[PDB]
């Protein structure tokens, strides 16, 4: 793991230090606080707030009832079609490890050592330069492994 960031302040917005070529890993460790409604990891084209930066990959756990993960893409401030994963491995009051692997045609996401979902590229991964983490979550560390 390279360019490791420890105990960032949330919301975190930071520049990904190298290109997201296939085989690249983003490793995020943290825990979900007890009153958590949702949080999100956003892979962004830039960090502009107005107009809001495009989000190539929105990864968004929600914690109401059984919960879900919602994945989507924001282009010119418009959300596309949602892809919802109902079998969530996140729970309130539990620690997690998210590993996002970038492949040629999609992201693959594993949580706590177990494959969770695939998400097909809607924007070219070469446009992504910014990692954003927002909402009710505590991040212990963020690390990269570049191919
Ligand atoms: C129809 O709810 C929207 O769903 C979106 C996901 O497609 C996204 O999760 C939005 O969350 C917040 C408001 C955001 O990051 O803009 C939410 O309001």
Tab-separated table of N, CA and C and ligand atoms in Angstrom:
chain	number	residue	atom	x	y	z
A	1	UNK	N	0.837	-1.244	0.000
A	1	UNK	CA	0.000	0.000	0.000
A	1	UNK	C	0.854	1.268	0.000
A	2	UNK	N	0.444	2.237	-0.819
A	2	UNK	CA	1.210	3.455	-1.105
A	2	UNK	C	0.352	4.691	-0.796
A	3	UNK	N	1.020	5.814	-0.536
A	3	UNK	CA	0.363	7.084	-0.207
A	3	UNK	C	-0.820	6.878	0.755
A	4	UNK	N	-0.530	6.244	1.886
A	4	UNK	CA	-1.538	5.897	2.878
A	4	UNK	C	-1.879	7.179	3.633
A	5	UNK	N	-3.175	7.391	3.861
A	5	UNK	CA	-3.697	8.518	4.622
A	5	UNK	C	-4.374	7.933	5.866
A	6	UNK	N	-3.993	8.419	7.049
A	6	UNK	CA	-4.528	7.918	8.309
A	6	UNK	C	-5.462	8.943	8.918
A	7	UNK	N	-6.550	8.454	9.505
A	7	UNK	CA	-7.499	9.260	10.268
A	7	UNK	C	-7.865	10.599	9.598
A	8	UNK	N	-8.316	10.563	8.329
A	8	UNK	CA	-8.713	11.817	7.676
A	8	UNK	C	-9.950	12.427	8.319
A	9	UNK	N	-10.076	13.746	8.240
A	9	UNK	CA	-11.336	14.414	8.581
A	9	UNK	C	-12.363	14.185	7.456
A	10	UNK	N	-13.580	13.805	7.851
A	10	UNK	CA	-14.732	13.618	6.960
A	10	UNK	C	-15.607	14.898	7.009
A	11	UNK	N	-16.012	15.473	5.869
A	11	UNK	CA	-15.786	14.934	4.529
A	11	UNK	C	-14.344	15.070	4.053
A	12	UNK	N	-13.840	14.006	3.437
A	12	UNK	CA	-12.512	13.985	2.830
A	12	UNK	C	-12.655	14.180	1.330
A	13	UNK	N	-11.841	15.073	0.783
A	13	UNK	CA	-11.664	15.220	-0.652
A	13	UNK	C	-10.162	15.294	-0.866
A	14	UNK	N	-9.638	14.440	-1.741
A	14	UNK	CA	-8.206	14.354	-1.968
A	14	UNK	C	-7.888	13.872	-3.364
A	15	UNK	N	-6.701	14.239	-3.834
A	15	UNK	CA	-6.240	13.898	-5.166
A	15	UNK	C	-5.645	12.503	-5.157
A	16	UNK	N	-6.098	11.668	-6.087
A	16	UNK	CA	-5.542	10.331	-6.264
A	16	UNK	C	-4.164	10.559	-6.909
A	17	UNK	N	-3.086	10.049	-6.288
A	17	UNK	CA	-1.729	10.426	-6.719
A	17	UNK	C	-1.209	9.829	-8.028
A	18	UNK	N	-1.933	8.890	-8.629
A	18	UNK	CA	-1.510	8.288	-9.895
A	18	UNK	C	-2.740	7.776	-10.656
A	19	UNK	N	-2.538	7.351	-11.902
A	19	UNK	CA	-3.642	6.967	-12.795
A	19	UNK	C	-4.301	5.677	-12.333
A	20	UNK	N	-5.615	5.565	-12.529
A	20	UNK	CA	-6.342	4.334	-12.169
A	20	UNK	C	-6.333	3.337	-13.322
A	21	UNK	N	-5.156	2.778	-13.582
A	21	UNK	CA	-4.981	1.736	-14.592
A	21	UNK	C	-5.564	0.425	-14.087
A	22	UNK	N	-5.938	-0.484	-15.005
A	22	UNK	CA	-6.457	-1.768	-14.535
A	22	UNK	C	-5.477	-2.507	-13.598
A	23	UNK	N	-6.034	-3.089	-12.540
A	23	UNK	CA	-5.256	-3.707	-11.476
A	23	UNK	C	-5.024	-2.798	-10.283
A	24	UNK	N	-5.338	-1.503	-10.410
A	24	UNK	CA	-5.204	-0.552	-9.304
A	24	UNK	C	-6.193	-0.880	-8.181
A	25	UNK	N	-5.720	-0.821	-6.937
A	25	UNK	CA	-6.583	-1.025	-5.771
A	25	UNK	C	-6.695	0.260	-4.961
A	26	UNK	N	-7.901	0.527	-4.461
A	26	UNK	CA	-8.128	1.529	-3.440
A	26	UNK	C	-8.616	0.758	-2.213
A	27	UNK	N	-7.888	0.862	-1.098
A	27	UNK	CA	-8.231	0.151	0.142
A	27	UNK	C	-8.643	1.175	1.204
A	28	UNK	N	-9.849	1.013	1.730
A	28	UNK	CA	-10.411	1.936	2.710
A	28	UNK	C	-10.808	1.113	3.923
A	29	UNK	N	-10.286	1.482	5.092
A	29	UNK	CA	-10.663	0.845	6.350
A	29	UNK	C	-11.332	1.868	7.247
A	30	UNK	N	-12.376	1.438	7.953
A	30	UNK	CA	-13.132	2.333	8.809
A	30	UNK	C	-14.139	1.579	9.642
A	31	UNK	N	-15.055	2.320	10.272
A	31	UNK	CA	-16.248	1.736	10.922
A	31	UNK	C	-17.476	2.631	10.771
A	32	UNK	N	-18.641	2.019	10.934
A	32	UNK	CA	-19.929	2.698	10.805
A	32	UNK	C	-20.380	3.110	12.209
A	33	UNK	N	-20.612	4.420	12.445
A	33	UNK	CA	-21.102	4.816	13.777
A	33	UNK	C	-22.542	4.352	14.025
A	34	UNK	N	-22.973	4.379	15.284
A	34	UNK	CA	-24.246	3.744	15.679
A	34	UNK	C	-25.481	4.450	15.109
A	35	UNK	N	-25.382	5.764	14.898
A	35	UNK	CA	-26.473	6.573	14.324
A	35	UNK	C	-26.313	6.868	12.811
A	36	UNK	N	-25.655	5.965	12.081
A	36	UNK	CA	-25.333	6.189	10.668
A	36	UNK	C	-26.543	5.920	9.782
A	37	UNK	N	-26.968	6.925	9.018
A	37	UNK	CA	-28.023	6.727	8.016
A	37	UNK	C	-27.430	6.244	6.689
A	38	UNK	N	-26.350	6.896	6.251
A	38	UNK	CA	-25.638	6.536	5.029
A	38	UNK	C	-24.250	7.192	4.966
A	39	UNK	N	-23.394	6.656	4.102
A	39	UNK	CA	-22.175	7.352	3.668
A	39	UNK	C	-21.880	7.002	2.207
A	40	UNK	N	-20.867	7.646	1.635
A	40	UNK	CA	-20.526	7.419	0.239
A	40	UNK	C	-19.043	7.611	-0.043
A	41	UNK	N	-18.529	6.776	-0.942
A	41	UNK	CA	-17.212	6.934	-1.529
A	41	UNK	C	-17.460	7.311	-2.993
A	42	UNK	N	-16.969	8.487	-3.400
A	42	UNK	CA	-17.156	9.011	-4.750
A	42	UNK	C	-15.831	9.137	-5.502
A	43	UNK	N	-15.757	8.499	-6.666
A	43	UNK	CA	-14.626	8.632	-7.558
A	43	UNK	C	-14.950	9.737	-8.542
A	44	UNK	N	-14.214	10.847	-8.446
A	44	UNK	CA	-14.632	12.115	-9.056
A	44	UNK	C	-13.687	12.608	-10.156
A	45	UNK	N	-14.265	13.283	-11.157
A	45	UNK	CA	-13.506	14.106	-12.095
A	45	UNK	C	-13.426	15.508	-11.511
A	46	UNK	N	-12.361	15.743	-10.747
A	46	UNK	CA	-12.102	17.027	-10.110
A	46	UNK	C	-12.769	17.173	-8.757
A	47	UNK	N	-12.645	18.375	-8.196
A	47	UNK	CA	-13.179	18.704	-6.877
A	47	UNK	C	-14.018	19.990	-6.866
A	48	UNK	N	-14.508	20.447	-8.021
A	48	UNK	CA	-15.345	21.658	-8.050
A	48	UNK	C	-16.681	21.377	-7.360
A	49	UNK	N	-17.156	22.340	-6.570
A	49	UNK	CA	-18.442	22.208	-5.877
A	49	UNK	C	-19.584	22.842	-6.673
A	50	UNK	N	-19.291	23.919	-7.403
A	50	UNK	CA	-20.275	24.597	-8.265
A	50	UNK	C	-19.563	25.016	-9.554
A	51	UNK	N	-19.919	24.444	-10.711
A	51	UNK	CA	-20.816	23.293	-10.826
A	51	UNK	C	-20.181	22.034	-10.215
A	52	UNK	N	-21.007	21.166	-9.643
A	52	UNK	CA	-20.537	19.972	-8.957
A	52	UNK	C	-19.797	19.009	-9.890
A	53	UNK	N	-18.649	18.508	-9.427
A	53	UNK	CA	-17.804	17.612	-10.218
A	53	UNK	C	-18.554	16.339	-10.589
A	54	UNK	N	-18.269	15.811	-11.779
A	54	UNK	CA	-18.828	14.535	-12.213
A	54	UNK	C	-18.309	13.446	-11.281
A	55	UNK	N	-19.170	12.481	-10.974
A	55	UNK	CA	-18.808	11.350	-10.118
A	55	UNK	C	-18.889	10.094	-10.979
A	56	UNK	N	-17.735	9.615	-11.431
A	56	UNK	CA	-17.662	8.402	-12.236
A	56	UNK	C	-18.249	7.171	-11.511
A	57	UNK	N	-17.972	7.042	-10.208
A	57	UNK	CA	-18.476	5.928	-9.407
A	57	UNK	C	-18.900	6.431	-8.020
A	58	UNK	N	-20.206	6.357	-7.767
A	58	UNK	CA	-20.815	6.710	-6.483
A	58	UNK	C	-21.075	5.387	-5.810
A	59	UNK	N	-20.414	5.132	-4.676
A	59	UNK	CA	-20.605	3.898	-3.903
A	59	UNK	C	-21.220	4.297	-2.566
A	60	UNK	N	-22.466	3.883	-2.327
A	60	UNK	CA	-23.308	4.504	-1.293
A	60	UNK	C	-24.117	3.488	-0.471
A	61	UNK	N	-23.520	2.989	0.629
A	61	UNK	CA	-24.274	2.214	1.614
A	61	UNK	C	-25.328	3.051	2.350
A	62	UNK	N	-26.510	2.463	2.523
A	62	UNK	CA	-27.600	3.053	3.297
A	62	UNK	C	-28.017	2.041	4.351
A	63	UNK	N	-28.392	2.548	5.517
A	63	UNK	CA	-28.551	1.723	6.703
A	63	UNK	C	-29.977	1.628	7.279
A	64	UNK	N	-30.983	2.167	6.583
A	64	UNK	CA	-32.384	2.009	7.021
A	64	UNK	C	-32.845	0.554	6.866
A	65	UNK	N	-33.382	-0.017	7.946
A	65	UNK	CA	-33.879	-1.403	7.968
A	65	UNK	C	-32.791	-2.436	7.584
A	66	UNK	N	-33.037	-3.303	6.593
A	66	UNK	CA	-32.035	-4.276	6.130
A	66	UNK	C	-30.871	-3.620	5.367
A	67	UNK	N	-31.121	-2.437	4.801
A	67	UNK	CA	-30.087	-1.636	4.154
A	67	UNK	C	-29.819	-2.059	2.725
A	68	UNK	N	-29.012	-1.258	2.040
A	68	UNK	CA	-28.599	-1.562	0.676
A	68	UNK	C	-27.360	-0.786	0.322
A	69	UNK	N	-26.780	-1.122	-0.825
A	69	UNK	CA	-25.750	-0.290	-1.457
A	69	UNK	C	-26.334	0.203	-2.774
A	70	UNK	N	-26.288	1.517	-2.969
A	70	UNK	CA	-26.710	2.155	-4.215
A	70	UNK	C	-25.474	2.627	-4.949
A	71	UNK	N	-25.364	2.254	-6.225
A	71	UNK	CA	-24.288	2.714	-7.103
A	71	UNK	C	-24.863	3.503	-8.271
A	72	UNK	N	-24.189	4.588	-8.637
A	72	UNK	CA	-24.666	5.471	-9.694
A	72	UNK	C	-23.517	6.334	-10.213
A	73	UNK	N	-23.824	7.180	-11.194
A	73	UNK	CA	-22.880	8.077	-11.818
A	73	UNK	C	-23.567	9.443	-11.988
A	74	UNK	N	-22.819	10.503	-11.699
A	74	UNK	CA	-23.274	11.877	-11.859
A	74	UNK	C	-22.485	12.481	-13.014
A	75	UNK	N	-23.198	12.906	-14.064
A	75	UNK	CA	-22.610	13.621	-15.211
A	75	UNK	C	-23.408	14.919	-15.431
A	76	UNK	N	-22.687	16.036	-15.550
A	76	UNK	CA	-23.271	17.386	-15.646
A	76	UNK	C	-24.468	17.577	-14.699
A	77	UNK	N	-24.225	17.220	-13.437
A	77	UNK	CA	-25.160	17.346	-12.310
A	77	UNK	C	-26.471	16.561	-12.404
A	78	UNK	N	-26.471	15.475	-13.178
A	78	UNK	CA	-27.638	14.596	-13.314
A	78	UNK	C	-27.264	13.143	-13.015
A	79	UNK	N	-27.975	12.551	-12.061
A	79	UNK	CA	-27.815	11.147	-11.713
A	79	UNK	C	-28.370	10.259	-12.827
A	80	UNK	N	-27.660	9.180	-13.138
A	80	UNK	CA	-28.135	8.187	-14.098
A	80	UNK	C	-29.039	7.169	-13.429
A	81	UNK	N	-29.180	6.023	-14.079
A	81	UNK	CA	-29.909	4.871	-13.541
A	81	UNK	C	-29.140	4.263	-12.353
A	82	UNK	N	-29.860	3.939	-11.281
A	82	UNK	CA	-29.283	3.314	-10.095
A	82	UNK	C	-29.075	1.805	-10.257
A	83	UNK	N	-28.007	1.288	-9.646
A	83	UNK	CA	-27.795	-0.152	-9.500
A	83	UNK	C	-27.732	-0.462	-8.005
A	84	UNK	N	-28.744	-1.179	-7.512
A	84	UNK	CA	-28.910	-1.415	-6.081
A	84	UNK	C	-28.507	-2.845	-5.731
A	85	UNK	N	-27.659	-2.974	-4.710
A	85	UNK	CA	-27.281	-4.267	-4.139
A	85	UNK	C	-27.958	-4.402	-2.770
A	86	UNK	N	-28.821	-5.405	-2.636
A	86	UNK	CA	-29.624	-5.590	-1.419
A	86	UNK	C	-28.919	-6.414	-0.338
A	87	UNK	N	-28.044	-7.336	-0.740
A	87	UNK	CA	-27.272	-8.126	0.216
A	87	UNK	C	-26.047	-7.320	0.648
A	88	UNK	N	-26.263	-6.418	1.602
A	88	UNK	CA	-25.184	-5.575	2.123
A	88	UNK	C	-24.432	-6.286	3.253
A	89	UNK	N	-23.089	-6.159	3.277
A	89	UNK	CA	-22.251	-6.641	4.370
A	89	UNK	C	-21.901	-5.589	5.430
A	90	UNK	N	-22.364	-4.354	5.254
A	90	UNK	CA	-22.161	-3.302	6.243
A	90	UNK	C	-23.231	-3.364	7.337
A	91	UNK	N	-22.806	-3.152	8.582
A	91	UNK	CA	-23.720	-2.964	9.708
A	91	UNK	C	-23.265	-1.785	10.560
A	92	UNK	N	-24.235	-1.081	11.144
A	92	UNK	CA	-23.949	-0.067	12.155
A	92	UNK	C	-23.138	-0.700	13.280
A	93	UNK	N	-22.196	0.074	13.824
A	93	UNK	CA	-21.321	-0.343	14.937
A	93	UNK	C	-20.260	-1.394	14.597
A	94	UNK	N	-20.054	-1.678	13.310
A	94	UNK	CA	-19.084	-2.678	12.866
A	94	UNK	C	-18.008	-2.038	11.992
A	95	UNK	N	-16.786	-2.562	12.105
A	95	UNK	CA	-15.679	-2.153	11.244
A	95	UNK	C	-15.801	-2.806	9.880
A	96	UNK	N	-15.151	-2.203	8.883
A	96	UNK	CA	-15.204	-2.694	7.500
A	96	UNK	C	-13.854	-2.548	6.806
A	97	UNK	N	-13.694	-3.273	5.706
A	97	UNK	CA	-12.597	-3.038	4.776
A	97	UNK	C	-13.161	-3.123	3.362
A	98	UNK	N	-13.111	-2.004	2.636
A	98	UNK	CA	-13.573	-1.917	1.249
A	98	UNK	C	-12.341	-1.968	0.376
A	99	UNK	N	-12.345	-2.848	-0.620
A	99	UNK	CA	-11.290	-2.867	-1.634
A	99	UNK	C	-11.957	-2.667	-2.983
A	100	UNK	N	-11.621	-1.556	-3.628
A	100	UNK	CA	-12.104	-1.260	-4.965
A	100	UNK	C	-10.953	-1.611	-5.890
A	101	UNK	N	-11.188	-2.578	-6.786
A	101	UNK	CA	-10.259	-2.904	-7.876
A	101	UNK	C	-10.798	-2.321	-9.180
A	102	UNK	N	-9.948	-1.591	-9.893
A	102	UNK	CA	-10.283	-1.061	-11.203
A	102	UNK	C	-9.882	-2.109	-12.232
A	103	UNK	N	-10.836	-2.528	-13.057
A	103	UNK	CA	-10.538	-3.414	-14.180
A	103	UNK	C	-10.779	-2.641	-15.466
A	104	UNK	N	-10.503	-3.295	-16.589
A	104	UNK	CA	-10.637	-2.712	-17.924
A	104	UNK	C	-12.031	-2.159	-18.184
A	105	UNK	N	-13.043	-2.973	-17.864
A	105	UNK	CA	-14.442	-2.692	-18.220
A	105	UNK	C	-15.337	-2.315	-17.037
A	106	UNK	N	-14.822	-2.422	-15.814
A	106	UNK	CA	-15.637	-2.182	-14.616
A	106	UNK	C	-14.804	-2.042	-13.340
A	107	UNK	N	-15.459	-1.592	-12.270
A	107	UNK	CA	-14.943	-1.710	-10.910
A	107	UNK	C	-15.483	-2.993	-10.318
A	108	UNK	N	-14.644	-3.669	-9.534
A	108	UNK	CA	-15.053	-4.775	-8.688
A	108	UNK	C	-14.822	-4.324	-7.256
A	109	UNK	N	-15.818	-4.536	-6.395
A	109	UNK	CA	-15.758	-4.133	-5.003
A	109	UNK	C	-15.920	-5.346	-4.083
A	110	UNK	N	-15.006	-5.473	-3.129
A	110	UNK	CA	-15.052	-6.513	-2.103
A	110	UNK	C	-15.099	-5.825	-0.748
A	111	UNK	N	-15.925	-6.346	0.159
A	111	UNK	CA	-16.027	-5.831	1.531
A	111	UNK	C	-15.684	-6.967	2.492
A	112	UNK	N	-14.745	-6.711	3.401
A	112	UNK	CA	-14.297	-7.698	4.391
A	112	UNK	C	-13.886	-9.034	3.761
A	113	UNK	N	-13.109	-8.944	2.682
A	113	UNK	CA	-12.537	-10.109	2.019
A	113	UNK	C	-13.470	-10.884	1.112
A	114	UNK	N	-14.690	-10.382	0.894
A	114	UNK	CA	-15.723	-11.099	0.143
A	114	UNK	C	-16.242	-10.220	-1.000
A	115	UNK	N	-16.262	-10.766	-2.218
A	115	UNK	CA	-16.770	-10.048	-3.402
A	115	UNK	C	-18.206	-9.596	-3.186
A	116	UNK	N	-18.480	-8.332	-3.484
A	116	UNK	CA	-19.777	-7.718	-3.198
A	116	UNK	C	-20.514	-7.255	-4.449
A	117	UNK	N	-19.823	-6.569	-5.364
A	117	UNK	CA	-20.466	-6.091	-6.596
A	117	UNK	C	-19.498	-5.701	-7.706
A	118	UNK	N	-20.046	-5.621	-8.915
A	118	UNK	CA	-19.357	-5.113	-10.093
A	118	UNK	C	-20.108	-3.876	-10.549
A	119	UNK	N	-19.393	-2.888	-11.086
A	119	UNK	CA	-20.031	-1.698	-11.627
A	119	UNK	C	-19.329	-1.311	-12.915
A	120	UNK	N	-20.080	-1.292	-14.023
A	120	UNK	CA	-19.513	-1.039	-15.351
A	120	UNK	C	-19.161	0.423	-15.514
A	121	UNK	N	-18.055	0.696	-16.197
A	121	UNK	CA	-17.641	2.078	-16.423
A	121	UNK	C	-18.672	2.799	-17.278
A	122	UNK	N	-19.090	3.974	-16.815
A	122	UNK	CA	-19.917	4.899	-17.594
A	122	UNK	C	-19.103	6.096	-18.106
A	123	UNK	N	-18.088	6.505	-17.342
A	123	UNK	CA	-17.092	7.486	-17.771
A	123	UNK	C	-15.767	6.741	-17.792
A	124	UNK	N	-14.891	7.077	-18.739
A	124	UNK	CA	-13.552	6.480	-18.805
A	124	UNK	C	-12.783	6.647	-17.493
A	125	UNK	N	-12.188	5.554	-16.956
A	125	UNK	CA	-11.455	5.661	-15.674
A	125	UNK	C	-10.273	6.639	-15.664
A	126	UNK	N	-9.719	6.951	-16.836
A	126	UNK	CA	-8.655	7.961	-16.972
A	126	UNK	C	-9.031	9.403	-16.582
A	127	UNK	N	-10.332	9.710	-16.533
A	127	UNK	CA	-10.825	11.038	-16.118
A	127	UNK	C	-10.899	11.200	-14.594
A	128	UNK	N	-10.774	10.096	-13.861
A	128	UNK	CA	-10.914	10.110	-12.415
A	128	UNK	C	-9.584	10.557	-11.815
A	129	UNK	N	-9.631	11.598	-10.992
A	129	UNK	CA	-8.445	12.085	-10.281
A	129	UNK	C	-8.683	12.430	-8.800
A	130	UNK	N	-9.878	12.165	-8.275
A	130	UNK	CA	-10.272	12.677	-6.959
A	130	UNK	C	-11.124	11.649	-6.214
A	131	UNK	N	-10.751	11.397	-4.955
A	131	UNK	CA	-11.480	10.513	-4.066
A	131	UNK	C	-12.167	11.378	-3.024
A	132	UNK	N	-13.475	11.180	-2.882
A	132	UNK	CA	-14.293	11.901	-1.925
A	132	UNK	C	-15.051	10.931	-1.041
A	133	UNK	N	-14.990	11.149	0.275
A	133	UNK	CA	-15.722	10.350	1.257
A	133	UNK	C	-16.608	11.290	2.095
A	134	UNK	N	-17.929	11.073	2.053
A	134	UNK	CA	-18.911	11.951	2.698
A	134	UNK	C	-19.899	11.141	3.524
A	135	UNK	N	-20.479	11.782	4.540
A	135	UNK	CA	-21.554	11.199	5.345
A	135	UNK	C	-21.108	10.690	6.700
A	136	UNK	N	-21.960	9.880	7.328
A	136	UNK	CA	-21.710	9.334	8.674
A	136	UNK	C	-20.843	8.073	8.651
A	137	UNK	N	-19.529	8.288	8.659
A	137	UNK	CA	-18.557	7.203	8.683
A	137	UNK	C	-17.261	7.697	9.334
A	138	UNK	N	-16.518	6.770	9.928
A	138	UNK	CA	-15.200	7.040	10.485
A	138	UNK	C	-14.186	6.236	9.691
A	139	UNK	N	-13.213	6.930	9.105
A	139	UNK	CA	-12.199	6.327	8.253
A	139	UNK	C	-10.921	6.236	9.077
A	140	UNK	N	-10.369	5.027	9.164
A	140	UNK	CA	-9.099	4.797	9.843
A	140	UNK	C	-7.979	5.040	8.869
A	141	UNK	N	-8.103	4.481	7.662
A	141	UNK	CA	-7.070	4.640	6.647
A	141	UNK	C	-7.580	4.477	5.228
A	142	UNK	N	-6.882	5.144	4.318
A	142	UNK	CA	-7.095	5.029	2.885
A	142	UNK	C	-5.738	4.734	2.288
A	143	UNK	N	-5.663	3.713	1.442
A	143	UNK	CA	-4.419	3.368	0.776
A	143	UNK	C	-4.631	2.979	-0.668
A	144	UNK	N	-3.585	3.157	-1.464
A	144	UNK	CA	-3.597	2.844	-2.879
A	144	UNK	C	-2.529	1.806	-3.203
A	145	UNK	N	-2.825	0.980	-4.191
A	145	UNK	CA	-1.856	0.067	-4.762
A	145	UNK	C	-1.962	0.255	-6.270
A	146	UNK	N	-0.944	0.867	-6.874
A	146	UNK	CA	-0.957	1.175	-8.307
A	146	UNK	C	-0.240	0.106	-9.107
A	147	UNK	N	-0.847	-0.286	-10.226
A	147	UNK	CA	-0.375	-1.414	-11.030
A	147	UNK	C	0.837	-1.019	-11.876
B	1	LIG	C1	-32.785	10.076	-5.165
B	1	LIG	O1	-31.828	10.027	-4.103
B	1	LIG	C2	-30.492	10.334	-4.514
B	1	LIG	O2	-29.853	9.131	-4.956
B	1	LIG	C3	-28.537	9.356	-5.461
B	1	LIG	C4	-27.981	8.031	-5.962
B	1	LIG	O3	-28.437	7.790	-7.287
B	1	LIG	C5	-27.630	9.939	-4.372
B	1	LIG	O4	-27.349	8.886	-3.430
B	1	LIG	C6	-28.236	11.175	-3.680
B	1	LIG	O5	-27.482	11.449	-2.486
B	1	LIG	C7	-26.920	12.756	-2.227
B	1	LIG	C8	-27.981	13.849	-2.079
B	1	LIG	C9	-25.844	13.174	-3.203
B	1	LIG	O6	-24.686	12.706	-3.054
B	1	LIG	O7	-26.126	13.987	-4.119
B	1	LIG	C10	-29.717	10.944	-3.339
B	1	LIG	O8	-30.345	12.174	-2.951
